[PDB]
């Protein structure tokens, strides 16, 4: 009962991430205002969830096949495109970019990217690397490539509009993000908090 | 000598990309002919900054 | 939907390039240990500005 | 639930709740439907909304 | 045509409508490096 073995506990689940908020007209005045979400996809990036709670009890992890899932809380009469991707490089930051088309193009350039209307649902996969690398669970520290396996950027391509030509201006909620994940944690521990 | 190959070969490669967004001009701004031109994007390979082509 | 391929493939390609010149420091400047270091060039792929790699 | 009373025990071999919508796609609201296998877990004790979700 | 809604009314917001992709095929001929 005192086994000193280190074994990967591959285990599945699903978790509620966040309610996304498309920006509208008032707040959306520049390009970086079109980045609705900047959410690391490290196991321990979602405090109240189950994945993060488990992560807290291990050193490491590796998404074997993760996926972000968008569920719309709006009707179809509203129309606005969204582009979502997961940069495997936690440091690559598009916030510095000024041109909107440049940002959407460097988004669509990523391999696991998707586009969709905020009235339907899709799935944003995570493309896992090839060098068997593991990542740490604790709160992000000196460097981020040790901890984060990816960073999910959610983008606003169009302007939020409704039944009529009316352009909404109140920055209202469009849907909800869900993570359908599978990862294996290696070394039992407790991470501080 | 360290000579560099004198072979001129046609390297053909294929893929998709993203040009730009379209902005319909609306009744206010649509008061002229030029106002009805929404996109003027060359198709030169080197006219798409962000892309990798 | 317009989904972009979820395929991660190892694109391997080969070729030569040009790093930099070597400058032997000579008796005047050669008065220290650091003076004997003529080249400090990383081998990262993105450390060769002019090259196409 | 009337036949239930004629026996003393039971066990669902296969159960699946099925939602039949009555609204059009012009309304929107997210829902979560889970069947908890422990009747003594009562979310009403939870104050935080995101925790409940 | 004019931009108009469900009704026969024209819109005056100068909105955005969509995006354009280029599905291309190109043949390059002479290796080099262009300056900049």
């Amino acid at each position: 009962a005192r086994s000193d073995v280190n074994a990967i506990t591959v285990l599945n689940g699903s978790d509620f991430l966040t309610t996304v908020k498309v920006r509208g007209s008032n707040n959306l005045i520049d390009s970086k205002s079109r980045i609705l979400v900047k959410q690391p996809i490290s196991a321990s990036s979602f405090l109240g969830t189950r994945i993060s709670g488990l992560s807290q009890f291990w050193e490491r992890y590796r998404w074997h096949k993760a996926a972000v899932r968008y569920v719309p809380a709006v009707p179809n009469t509203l129309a606005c495109q969204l582009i979502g991707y997961i940069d495997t490089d936690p440091l690559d930051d598009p916030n510095v970019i000024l041109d909107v088309d440049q940002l959407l193009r460097q988004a669509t350039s990523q391999v696991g990217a998707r586009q969709w209307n905020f009235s339907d649902t899709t799935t944003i996969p995570l493309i896992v690397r090839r060098d068997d690398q593991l990542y740490y669970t604790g709160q992000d520290k000196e460097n981020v490539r040790f901890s984060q396996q990816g960073v999910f950027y959610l983008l606003q391509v169009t302007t939020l509009l409704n039944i009529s030509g009316e352009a909404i201006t109140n920055d209202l909620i469009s849907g909800s993000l869900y993570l359908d994940w599978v990862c294996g944690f290696s070394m039992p521990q407790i991470n501080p908090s | 000598r360290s000579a560099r190959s004198d072979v001129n070969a046609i390297t053909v490669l294929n893929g998709s990309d993203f040009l730009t967004t379209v902005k319909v001009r609306g009744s206010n701004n649509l008061i002229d002919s030029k106002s009805r031109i929404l996109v003027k994007q060359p198709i030169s390979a080197s006219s798409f900054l962000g892309t990798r082509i | 939907r317009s989904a972009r391929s979820d395929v991660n493939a190892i694109t391997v390609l080969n070729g030569s390039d040009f790093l930099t010149t070597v400058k032997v420091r000579g008796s005047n400047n050669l008065i220290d240990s650091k003076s004997r270091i003529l080249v400090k060039q990383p081998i990262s792929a993105s450390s060769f500005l002019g090259t196409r790699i | 639930s009337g036949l239930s009373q004629f026996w003393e025990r039971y066990r669902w071999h296969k159960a699946a709740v099925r939602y039949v919508p009555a609204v059009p796609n012009t309304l929107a609201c997210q829902l979560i439907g889970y069947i908890d296998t422990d009747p003594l877990d009562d979310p009403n004790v939870i104050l935080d909304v995101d925790q409940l979700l | 045509t004019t931009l108009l809604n469900i009704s026969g009314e024209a819109i005056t917001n100068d909105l955005i409508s969509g995006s354009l992709y280029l599905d291309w095929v190109c043949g390059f001929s002479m290796p080099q490096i262009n300056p900049s």
Binding site: N76, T108, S109, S119, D120 | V12, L13, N14, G15, S16, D17, T51, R52, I53 | R1, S2, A3, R4, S5, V7, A9, T11 | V20, P21, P24, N25, T26 | Y21, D23
Partner: peptide, 21 residues
């Protein structure tokens, strides 16, 4: 002839009103 350089795919999905059961 590097295949699948920047491939993109399109797939439509109709969005009708009042899907009835």
């Amino acid at each position: 002839t590097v295949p699948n350089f920047n491939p993109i795919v399109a797939k439509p999905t109709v969005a009708p009103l009042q899907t009835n059961i």
